[PDB]
Structure 1
């Protein structure tokens, strides 16, 4: 009846207004009210109008620090939400450019009775906010996928006698001509309701209704549309039974890998579940050790009630150093800043020997670590954002920190030591750091820096197209030359095949650019995270994702790929592997006896049946030809 639909509208409005107004800080409420006033839904946010601050001496009172706590801001790439964590009641998940795979909910977390609203911006690209005209990417949009369930269960589902308004998605830029909403089960399990805000997606069974999502500003949709993807209620069929499978009912990620001098292989990343130990809260960091024959020796999980990940790991040959960021307190003499870099040392028996956290209110991210042949440790990251490199000794004493960059945004996506006391860093900049940027609207270029043993700058170099270029990872070869891998939307190493393409750049120790190779399909091709490794014979290995037919026929959605190059940039092989669902590689580690490990993440069943949402996997390849071996061979 009319009065049932009117009651639903009222109860949805009142519930969202209550949750949003109680959870979002006043400064964020004020910004969102002003946008909505330009474009009535300002009435969901009842907080007082508050001056928005950028120049407080207290980083915490500044809009960027407040915004960071309630946001996942992804990249110009086609991203999975690799920073998802159940640490806030309300979160803004912002895909930016690229065909993003957006999740905010962890179906393996204990969320009983908790309020959860995830606000999704599929695109909302930088150029929509930037008033300068004629940007290359002005008015561009991508096919985003909003994940509101999987094969296991619907997300935001309270399964109770209420309308289920305590947990819901809110998607603000859904375009039914382009985007996809992913749901548990099949279309007969849902009802769409026209509401003031746009469209309500209700789960419906005999027992009752539960609000799963609200689609802002869109009406008169159908559950028969191509823009709804239904996952059913059974785990996908297992492929690649040769892989090592790592998964809980929660979101589980491998982000990095390494090897020790005995051939033991290590993996690590973040989990929303109890993977290496009992979950401490939200996402935790984890790592695991395998012997040279594929046998798991131990797993460790550490963290806070906040969010942390292992983003990088490296070995001095016996110990394993791990790095990342935390929103909590990992070191018990540290005053946490809520967004801090950490470094820790594990022994080969899985004892956390020490941990160091940079407790400052300054926002800090750190994705990269390396160890030199003297056993000193280098981390890199960013804190406008500026890059840094930090050097530590094996007892975790800081030897120096180098900070550098431009007046605009610089990020770090690489650190690598040579044999000779020098360290390289690399990353992305909107500015003119080592060259004048050809982008007319602050599109990223790639940069490289060489620091000496004292942390002084030997040189800076910059390369790019006028479009976005994005570096993900760097590594040195045995001669001390520096290699970088990334994606480009332009013609960097050659004519762009379409959309994102892969590049591999080499510089010598003196800063001369030797070559840039580019390869790809007409579709999206990119390395990702820990995307380059170089073995003792100076063979280069690259890894990432593609939604094209890059190494082979595409299995479905994005797949993983791996490639081998020689030190002159000749392609020796390129292999593609995956499931019918979303997959990406995240890391590659060469070992010896011609063995290579590629590891990553998946929404499908890779190695064994999917345990829930994201699972992880590790694949052993033959380095001669890319052929997949049994992990246990």
Structure 2
């Protein structure tokens, strides 16, 4: 019976949210939701007002740590939730700009009996907090997809004698004119109830009801509305049986790839399941080796009871170096506080040689790694602390400036000894999305900034620009460059060619290398070793086109390969939702080919690696059945392409 559902839902959500979320975070959230005009969730947080310790050096009190522990803050891009992990009872999942595919509940995780509330914000963009109107994106919003179930099962589903209040989504900014709520089954499986908070979505069967989600501030919806997408009960039909399929019942992601000197191909990423080994807890890091004929030689899985991923990998020709972040304590290491970065070394036989966990009392992230021809290793990332030197935003002064990251680069020898760490940026946000060594002892880094790092930012409201830094063999800066439009421009990855010139790829909402075709467009920029911008190419469709994650590689012939996602007809007719794409360019930016592939469901490439004089590998993630039947939520895939024309080959030969 749905009698008194309103009262029961409010008391359940209030009790769980107020029991789980720290008082500092409750105080912060209450302030934000009231200021923003999304106040429905506020009365659910009843902890006392508490001083927010934005700059505490105690890892347990440091507010960036607290906020990060209970949130997935996504990017200005159209994001899948690439950071989701079953490590907390309550999570705030914040899509920000772009058309986000928002998930927080892993249907393959053992969550029986666990309290689970995912609080979703599809947009709630940064511009809402602008004291001054007129910013280019003020008042803009995007179609976000809130994933509350799929072909396999409803999410947040306890399937018991209660109303199923212990697990539920709470979507705070659902706009039925733009957004979509994705549900398992069909409309006859649900009942909507108007409640004080908005709308309750109940799964309904003969034996009773189970609360799947609450939509704050919206009432009088219809399950016949096109803003509900029902997924039935049957896994998607398989396409691209030529691909290598990697998947478990849980969320599985390839985030990076590399090749060794013998042509063996490696992939890796994160998994909520038991992919390379038995799951240790929440998301673990994993990697796998394939021979050049496509046979898997081994898979390995590592981490902690907390959350970690492999975000980058590279080879010295034999060994495989891997980099990412962790929320826990890795083997043979000590935590530095909050989230930390790590570098690890695997030999060609899959033996873990060592792991080095590094960081400060506050949050580090690290998505990038490169290995030079001498065998030294560079990682890069961002830090809220003072890792390579004092953070540009050290403490709170008379003018408050929100705690913010600087970029860093760290150099290591083959035994994992740290040779130096460099840190740089502005008082505001500076993130890292690239690292690449040249042949002459230098290393480049790149990323995004809200500030004026290498040049005056032409945005009027702190919109992102791209930046590049050249460091010498000792970690000293030789130059800093910055480029962009007045709108958001976002870098994903960088790489050098055989001459030592530096290339970067990303997306733009403006006219960076030419007239924007619509929405997000792709760019490729080239700088010489002396910091001169040589050219920027921009291309796309009228729809949303972007590289993603490990989006560039350069082969021994100085051909450039890019990869990412598009919801347009970029390389061909779109199969449905976002598809993957890849492209090849020469060193002067002439585009040699452009291909698109995927399933009728959401796909994105995440990594591209070219074998010198061999095959091209494009790998990524999907909600569809790519290679074989989807085993649960996100699965991953690798495609072997002919590098001359982008045509897909059978993975196994």
Contact 2:411–2:419 (CA under 8 A) maintained in structure 1 = yes
- Native 8 Å contact 1:321 1:346 kept in 2: yes
8 Å Cα contact 2:174/2:218 also seen in 1? yes
Runs of 4+ in structure 1 displaced over 6 angstroms? none
> Is the alpha carbon distance of 1:92 and 1:275 closer, same or farther for their aligned partners in structure 2, counting shifts above 3 Å?
same
Instruction: Return the offset for 1:60.
Output: 3.3
Equivalents in 1 of 2:459, 2:41: separation in Å?
36
User: d(CA) in 2 for partners of 1:546 and 1:70?
Assistant: 30
> How far 1:13 moved relative to its partner?
0.9
Whether the aligned pair in 2 keeps the contact of 1:186 and 1:231 (CA below 8 Å) is yes
Work out the CA distance in 1 between the residues paired with 2:597 and 2:9. Answer: 43
Give, in angstroms, the shift of residue 224 of structure 1: 0.4
Matched residues in 2 for 1:136 and 1:442: separation?
10
CA distance in 1 between partners of 2:33 and 2:522 (Å) = 39
The residue aligned with 2:141 is 141
Q: How does 1:277-288 map to 2 (within 5 A)?
A: 277-288=277-288
Three-state SS of the structure 1 residue aligned to 2:310 is coil
Deviation at 1:59, TM superposition (A): 4.4
- Aligned partners of 1:99 and 1:143 also within 8 Å: yes
Cα distance in 2 for residues equivalent to 1:245 and 1:207: 38
* Distance of 1:363 and 1:205 partners within structure 2: 45
Q: What is the CA deviation profile of residues 514-569 of structure 1, one whole-angstrom value per residue up to 9, with x for unaligned ones? A: 00000000000000000000000001000000000000000000000000000000
Matched residues in 1 for 2:283 and 2:459: separation? Answer: 37
Shift of residue 592 of structure 1? 3.4
8 A Cα contact 1:84 1:103, kept in partner? yes
User: How far 1:45 sits from its partner (Å)?
Assistant: 1.4
Aligned residue for 1:533, secondary structure, equals: strand
> Deviations 1:33-89 (Å, cap 9, x if unpaired)?
334555775332121111222132324323222111100000000000000000000
- Equivalent residue of 1:13, what SS? helix
RMSD of aligned alpha carbons: 1.1
Contact 2:304 2:331 in 1 (8 A): no
Q: Is the 8 A contact 2:182 2:228 kept in 1?
A: yes
Answer yes or no: is the 8 Å Cα contact 1:185–1:232 preserved in 2: yes
Q: CA deviation at 1:5?
A: 4.5
Q: Per-residue displacement from partner, 1:201-233 (whole Å, max 9, x unpaired)?
A: 111111211100000010011110000001100
- Contact between 2:87 and 2:282, CA under 8 Å: does it hold in 1? yes
| 1:156-212 deviation digits (Å, cap 9, x = unpaired) | 001101101000000000000100000011111111111111101111111211100
Name the SS of the counterpart of 1:261 in structure 2.
coil
Q: Take 1:376 and 1:41, find their aligned partners in 2: how far apart are those partners?
A: 50
Alignment deviations for residues 269-307 of structure 1 (CA, whole Å, 9 cap, x no partner): 000000000111111000000001100000000111111
2:230 aligned partner: 230
Segments of structure 1 that go 5 or more residues without pairing to the other structure are none
Is the CA contact 1:594–1:624 (under 8 Å) kept in the aligned structure 2?
Answer: no
**Cα distance change of structure 1 residues 481 and 38 upon mapping to structure 2, 3 Å threshold:** closer
Q: Which stretch shows the higher mean deviation, 400-409 or 352-361?
A: 352-361
Aligned mates of 2:444, 2:32 — CA distance in 1? 42
Find the residue that maps to 1:344 and give its secondary structure: strand
When residues 34 and 333 of structure 1 are mapped into structure 2, their CA distance, relative to the original with a 3 A threshold, is: closer
Query: CA offset at residue 29 of structure 1?
Result: 1.2
For the 8 Å contact 1:331–1:356, the answer to whether it is kept is no
Q: Which residue of 1 aligns with 2:350?
A: 350
Contact 1:74 1:81 in 2 (8 A): yes
Contact 1:314 1:320 in 2 (8 A): yes
Shift of 1:261: 0.4
- Judging changes above 3 Å, is the alpha-carbon distance between structure 1 residues 541 and 41 closer, same or farther for their aligned structure 2 residues? closer
TM-score by length of 1: 0.98
Partner Cα separation in structure 2 for residue 488 and residue 349 of structure 1: 41
User: Helix, strand or coil for the counterpart of 2:308?
Assistant: coil
Structure 1 residue aligned with 2:163 = 163
SS at match of 2:461: coil
User: What is the distance in 2 between the residues matched to 1:195 and 1:210?
Assistant: 15
Give, in angstroms, the shift of residue 129 of structure 1.
1.7
Give me the whole-angstrom Cα distance separating, in 2, the residues matched to 1:307 and 1:390.
Answer: 22
Contact 2:259–2:611 at 8 Å: present in 1 too?
Answer: yes
TM-score (norm 2): 0.95
For residues 574 and 38 of structure 1, the distance between their equivalents in structure 2, rounded to whole angstroms, comes to 45
User: Structure 1 residues 484 and 131, CA, compared in 2 at 3 Å: closer, same or farther?
Assistant: same
CA distance in 2, matches of 1:33, 1:604: 38
User: Is 2:282–2:305's contact at 8 Å kept on the other side of the alignment?
Assistant: yes
Q: 2:81 touches 2:102 (CA, 8 Å); kept in 1?
A: yes
1:186–1:398 CA distance, 2 compared to 1 (3 A) = same
Residue of structure 1 equivalent to 2:309: 309
- Kept after mapping to 1: 8 A contact 2:449/2:464: yes
Change (3 A) 1:557 1:563: same
Deviation at residue 152 of structure 1 after TM alignment: 0.5
Q: CA deviation at 1:360?
A: 2.9
Which of 508, 512, 529 aligns to 2:528? It is: 508
Asked if the contact 2:76/2:98 (under 8 Å) is kept, the reply is yes
CA 37–266 in structure 1, closer or farther in 2 if over 3 Å, else same: closer
SS at match of 2:261: coil
Deviation string, structure 1 residues 465-500 (Cα, Å, up to 9, x no partner): 000000000000000000000000000011000000
Contact 1:334 1:359 in 2 (8 A): no
1:37-186 correspondence runs (5 A): 37=34, 41-186=41-186
Whether the 8 Å CA contact 1:331–1:357 is kept in 2: the answer is: no
Aligned-partner SS, 2:3? helix
* Residue in structure 2 matching 1:597, options 599, 611, 617: 617
Alignment partners' CA distance in 1, 2:442 and 2:355? 25
Secondary structure of 2:6's counterpart equals helix
Which of 517, 521, 525 is the aligned partner of 2:541?
521
CA distance in structure 2 between the aligned counterparts of 1:178 and 1:36, rounded to whole angstroms: 21
Cα deviation, 1:497-521, whole Å, max 9, x if unaligned, reads: 0000000000011111000000000
Check the 8 A contact 2:238/2:626 in 1, yes or no.
yes
Partner Cα separation in structure 1 for residue 358 and residue 378 of structure 2: 14
**CA distance in 2 between partners of 1:272 and 1:302 (Å):** 12
Deviations 1:128-169 (A, max 9, x none): 122222100000000000000111100000110110100000
Equivalent pair of 2:62/2:362 in contact (CA under 8 Å): no
CA distance in 1, matches of 2:137, 2:222: 31
Cα 1:455–1:241, aligned 2, differ >3 Å: closer, same or farther?
same
CA distance in 1: counterparts of 2:356 and 2:556, whole angstroms: 31
Q: CA deviation at 1:407?
A: 1.0
Q: CA–CA distance in 2 between the matches of 1:30 and 1:431?
A: 28
1:89–1:116 Cα contact (<8 Å) kept: yes
Partners of 1:59 and 1:131 in 2: how far apart? Answer: 31
Residue 80 of structure 2 aligns to a residue in which SS?
Answer: coil
The aligned residue for residue 429 of structure 1 is 449
Q: Quote how far apart the aligned CAs of 1:395 are.
A: 0.3
1:377 maps to what in 2? Answer: 377
